[PDB]
Each structure stands twice: as C-alpha cells, then as structure tokens.
Swiss-Prot record, chain B:
<feature type="coiled-coil region">
    <location>
        <begin position="194"/>
        <end position="238"/>
    </location>
</feature>
<feature type="disulfide bond">
    <location>
        <begin position="15"/>
        <end position="21"/>
    </location>
</feature>
<feature type="site" description="Cleavage; by host TMPRSS2 or CTSL">
    <location>
        <begin position="86"/>
        <end position="87"/>
    </location>
</feature>
<feature type="disulfide bond">
    <location>
        <begin position="277"/>
        <end position="288"/>
    </location>
</feature>
<feature type="glycosylation site" description="N-linked (GlcNAc...) (hybrid) asparagine; by host">
    <location>
        <position position="73"/>
    </location>
</feature>
<comment type="function">
    <text>Precursor of the fusion protein processed in the biosynthesis of the S protein and the formation of virus particle. Mediates fusion of the virion and cellular membranes by functioning as a class I viral fusion protein. Contains two viral fusion peptides that are unmasked after cleavage. The S2/S2' cleavage occurs during virus entry at the cell membrane by host TMPRSS2 or during endocytosis by host CSTL.</text>
</comment>
<feature type="region of interest" description="Heptad repeat 1">
    <location>
        <begin position="165"/>
        <end position="215"/>
    </location>
</feature>
<feature type="disulfide bond">
    <location>
        <begin position="10"/>
        <end position="32"/>
    </location>
</feature>
<protein>
    <recommendedName>
        <fullName>Spike protein S2</fullName>
    </recommendedName>
</protein>
Amino acid sequence: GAISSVLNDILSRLDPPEAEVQIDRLITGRLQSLQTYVTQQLIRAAEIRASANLAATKMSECVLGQSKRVDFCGKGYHLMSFPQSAPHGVVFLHVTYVPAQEKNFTTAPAICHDGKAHFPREGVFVSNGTHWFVTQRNFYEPQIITTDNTFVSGNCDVVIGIVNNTVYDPLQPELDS
Amino acid sequence: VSMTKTSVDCTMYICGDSTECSNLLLQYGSFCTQLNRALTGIAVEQDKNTQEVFAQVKQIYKTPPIKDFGGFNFSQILPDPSKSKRSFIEDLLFNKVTKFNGLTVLPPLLTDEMIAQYTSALLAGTITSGWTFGAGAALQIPFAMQMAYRFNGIGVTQNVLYENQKLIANQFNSAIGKIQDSLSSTASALGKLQDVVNQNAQALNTLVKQLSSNFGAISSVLNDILSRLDPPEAEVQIDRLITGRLQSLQTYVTQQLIRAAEIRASANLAATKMSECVLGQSKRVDFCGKGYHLMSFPQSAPHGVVFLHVTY
Amino acid sequence: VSMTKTSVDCTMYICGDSTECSNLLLQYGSFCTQLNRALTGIAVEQDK
Amino acid sequence: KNKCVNFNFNGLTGTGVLTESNKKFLPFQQFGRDIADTTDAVRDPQTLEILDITPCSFGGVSVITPGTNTSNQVAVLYQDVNCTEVNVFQTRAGCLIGAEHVNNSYECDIPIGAGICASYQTSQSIIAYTMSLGAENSVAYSNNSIAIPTNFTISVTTEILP
Amino acid sequence: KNKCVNFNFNGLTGTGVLTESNKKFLPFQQFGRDIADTTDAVRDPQTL
Amino acid sequence: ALDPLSETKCTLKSFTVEKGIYQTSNFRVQPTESIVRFPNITNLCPFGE
C-alpha cells in the first residue's frame, strides 16, 4: 500500500512527516511478513521436532536394540537397523524377517495321548495329512511331538475340536534300553 | 485422523467481485498467494494422514463364507453386504456426527466406502490370518489358535483359553453388545470427533463472519465504498478491509496449521496404534485400551478411526 | 505436563477502561472473541 | 434463472443464481439470510413468490499434468461445479475435462480426490480411474488348516525422516 | 573498488562493495536487480 | 494464459513441472444480464393535480 517498495526510495524522496506515513506501511507489511514466516517456521519446527523424536525413538529402539513393535521399524518382524546420515536428516535401513514360501498344513488346538490334553510349549501343531509334528509360527521345521515340546493340562473332554495322536516319551526307550 | 479439507481463495475472500480492490491487494504481493499455498499444503497432509493410518495393508482381504470363528461373533464389526458397506457399529459412528463465498471444501482422497474397505481388509486379515499379513504375506490360522498366541503373548498359557473357550467367546460378544448399546444410548463417546468438527466449523464460521465487519471502514461492503466515496477516499477505506480481512486469513491459516499439528500427532498415534496394536501385539501397558492387550479391531468413523482394544 | 493457564482479557488488554476504544474494537469483528476462545481452549487443554 | 447473474432487488443487491423452491417466507420481510449471515432466499418484490438464491458457480482450476519430460498433455478439473457451467467426465470432485474414464481400477499415481486418481497410460494419455486399495485376495480360512512359511527372505526397508 | 562505500548512481542509493563480475550487461540494460528486485549491479553513466 | 499446462508454469514459476495437481487459477461464471426486480412501482404522487 505504500508509494514505493524500496525503503531508500521513500527516504530519498519524501520529507520526514510524509515519509513516515509511507515507511510505516512498509514496516507494518514487512513486520507481518516476518510474523508469518516465523509463525510457519515455529510450526514447521514442531513438525520436524516430532519427526526428530520419531527418528530418535526409532533409532534407540531399532539400532541400539531390537524393537518388538510390529510394523514400527519397517514391514515385518524387525531384526536390526543400520542408520545412514543424510543432509539435515537420517535414513534407516530396517532389516526385517519376512516369509517368502508358504505351505498349508492341517493343524489342531491340541492332541490326545491317554485322555489328557497336550498343548504345545513353543510353537504349534501341524500335520502333512498322515503324521503330526511340532513347528514354530515363523518357519517350518516339523519336530516329533514329544513330552519335552508339549505341555499337559486339563483333559480331552473340555477342549473343543481336539484330536488324537501319539506322544513320543523319551523315558520309554531309555527304560527299555 | 484428518480434518475437513478447505481451500480459501485469498483473492475472493479479500476482494469479492471487485477489480479496484485487487489492484490494491496486489500491492502486498505474495502475501495473498502464500496463504493459498499454506492451505493447499495442509489439505495434502490430511490425505497423507489417512494413508499412513488406513493404507497399511497391501492386499484387499475379504471375509470368507465360513463365519465359524470359534464362537466369536464379529457381525457388529464386519461389513453389511446388503448396505455403503459399513458394519452395525460403523453405522452408529457415522450417524452420531453431523458455500462459495471464498471457501472451497475439497473432498478427501479416501472415501467412507474406501476407508470402510480398508477396515474390512484389516478386520478380515486380523480375524483370518492373525498378524502375519501385516508382517508379510497373509498366513491363515484358526482364530482359536490365534487367540492362543495372544494369551501366550501376555504370560497366559494357551490351556486357559481352550478350558474357557465358550466363556471367552461369550464375554467378547457381550462386550461388543455393550459398545453397540453404549454408542446408541449416548453420543458422548464420539465427543472427540465432534470437537474436531467444532474447531473446523467455528474456524469457518469466524472466517465468513469477519467479511461483514467494517475494520474501521465506513461499510463492510466493497461496492458501498467504491460507489459512495471518492476514489482517493476509497483507497484508505478499502485498505482497512484488506488489512483487516487479511488478518482473518492469517488467523484462520495460523489456526489450521496449529490444528494440523494436533491432527498430525493424533494421526501418527492412530497410525502407531494401527501399525502396532491392530497389525500386531503390544506389551505396552495402557497402549491398547486398559489391560493386557489381546487384539484390536479397527472401525471407521467420520474423519477418524475407532479402535476396539480387546484386553485381558 | 502443563503450562501456566493464562486467560488474558482481549478487551481489557487492547482497551483499558475506554469506551471510545471499545467501539472501534467492535469494528474488528470477532478477533477479540476468537483470541478468548483460543485462550480458553489452551487453558483447558493443560487440564487434559 | 439457473445462471450466475447480478441482481438489485428492492432491499439488497449483489450477484447470485436465481432459482425456485418450496422455501417459505414471512410476507412482512424482504430478504433472508443463512446461518453465517450470508445471502439466502429472498422474497420477490413482485407478487408473493419465494426466490431461492443459489450461490454462483465458483471453484478452482485444478490442472492435472504429468511431468513435462514425459508429455505435455494435461487435464482440468473445475472444483465443486458441474460440466453444464462451461474428455468431459463429471467426477465427484467436479467436472474433469481431458481424461478418459476407465472402469478398471489401478494404483493411485496422481491423487485427485473422492476416490479418483489419474495416470499417463494407454498412444498414452491421461486416464481417470477409481483408486485401487490393493489386490483382491480372499485368504482361505478353516478351523483345521494353518499356513506356516517354508522359506523366508531378509528384506531391507528404507525409512527416511528429517 | 573492493571497499564498503555508499553508492548513488542516478538515485540508485545503496551501500556495498564494488567489483567487476561476470555480469554481461546488454547495450540497452542500464542496471540489474537481484531476486529481491534490489539493485545489485549498475553501469557507470560517465564512461561505459 | 495459453493453456492449462502453461497455467501451472506461472503458478509454480518454473518451466519444468513435476507430476501432480496444482490449483492455478479460480473458476467463476461471470454475469451477462441483470435480473433486477422492483415491487411494481405505481400510484405515483399526484403531480397531475
């Protein structure tokens, strides 16, 4: 709204009582420009500070240790992370465990050896159609169902959908040998 | 998750159908355009909030015809095939929540149906494949066997589950029934989302009302000044409306950027609770509702998301 | 956790016991009231 | 009627679109206002009919364009206005002119709004399609079947934060 | 040259350091401005 | 003002424009004919007397 945008132009043209009227318009405008710039930078700073806390939170949890937070540091079960410096930032290399090959297997919530319900200690029960084996949720390694890999609790009358199977007792062949 | 996308024309708000007004408005320069770039930038960020929150699943997972999930009745959260495609609870969430004067209300990228399809995909994967679909490829597993891993994740042996399989399913179904009754009995549960609508609504209400203010001018209307007063008298009076209404835009833009920080932190929290609690299991106390976290079922809502934190 | 709850009167600050000032302040619309609403919203948020 | 035009009635003036509706009006008043004190339906100065004042068609010229190194073809979307105010295809966001409507859903490359995105594909041209939310994969499920992975692949995911 | 001095070339007031740069002024171009529309280079009126 | 492609160039102030959507200008239907109304002004003053 002033007569000219250059401050020195008004200073060199108009008298003090006439220049102050036009200079005040530049001051009022240029002040508002900084108030807008500083307002955006103050707000954007909080945004970058939130991302900085996220980077610091991601770094400590995923670089300095192992983060059990699912889908927090990359897609998949997080294993490790290797950070990389960047201009005014940081780049993480999230190493995650992801399955590639899959195969369907017949399963059951538990198995019955002598009327008692046998649950898995670590992993789940699976079957290839003929025999039953033990395996973990993250990989296929069929192990023979044994007392050292299954836990007994309750009975086979309360469990819903339970099946029958033979449990390998390590004490049996040792007592026979 | 997100706010109402708005794009306020800096030139139409300050100068509504006035050529002489624009000649004075151009004297300020990029102050007008910078306000448009601000609101334009925020509206793009609102879409990113819905993407980082909702668009976390790769493939669209469908509910199978076998509705036998071990006694767990998900009918209140699964989508209605006859109706948009929303569940009974999602219907309650959208029913309890409620032009060209320079404002331009832009639509969101993801619609209510599309956001509902993300929740149905997340819900279908959560019911059928557990949390393997979020980590990698969807690995089917019986829901009774899924819950066994959930109890084992909180120190409870899986024999406790199958010993109380029917009771656990009944406790789950009854709890969902209370939420159906709770959301339909009172709308105070969605007061958080209503506040977001009020903050956006009051911002637009204040935005439009400031156009009728004089700001020291003889009249709030531009035509009255140009018609009644002389040109050199109008240069001062029209400037008072320009300088005054520009503060309304700067105040509106400033408040939206401030609310953009609040909705962004909430969006990251929702994205954090969708990536961590919904697509996985969390040992963080009070991170999924109250109690030892079992599982979380997401539910779409107007400009937001609802988590049903199943806890032990 | 919290901040100093400061409910500054928009009218008394701009216009301290001046009726002529207040009539001119009304010409600025709801900038006075909006600042009070902002100072009211920030105050209760610290309680939250 | 049905056109953005200037007006000057007995009580007020301005610019708007003249329409008719079943809105009531008190005979002892001249013009009406909305919630935000905006120009609303008014009384006809002539014989007693209620004039519904619809706001003028106004929006934004949202130009859809790929990278200039790829092609110079572009499309325009007039926001919150129909095509009757002026390749042509009415979208939920507005009248999209310069894009072919494709029923097949593809990945969102150029997000427009309201579940619509654009991309420069086939000869190649800007097409309009519904935003794909992923590949439809109905995962088999039963109470006696489980998928255990037989092999795995360690993947490195790049994350960037300021 | 190479000194902080106050310039005045036909009203083009300012303060800076004078030196010879790679600016290729055309015959009609009198003086140049920076991105801020502020005079960053001029031409001597007396001798080109 | 040549074409919508050039409208984005002056909006972004760059000859090269990247893939995206940019609101260049504002759409508005301008008036063409007045629809002035008056309440059947008649029964003037008795100047004929």
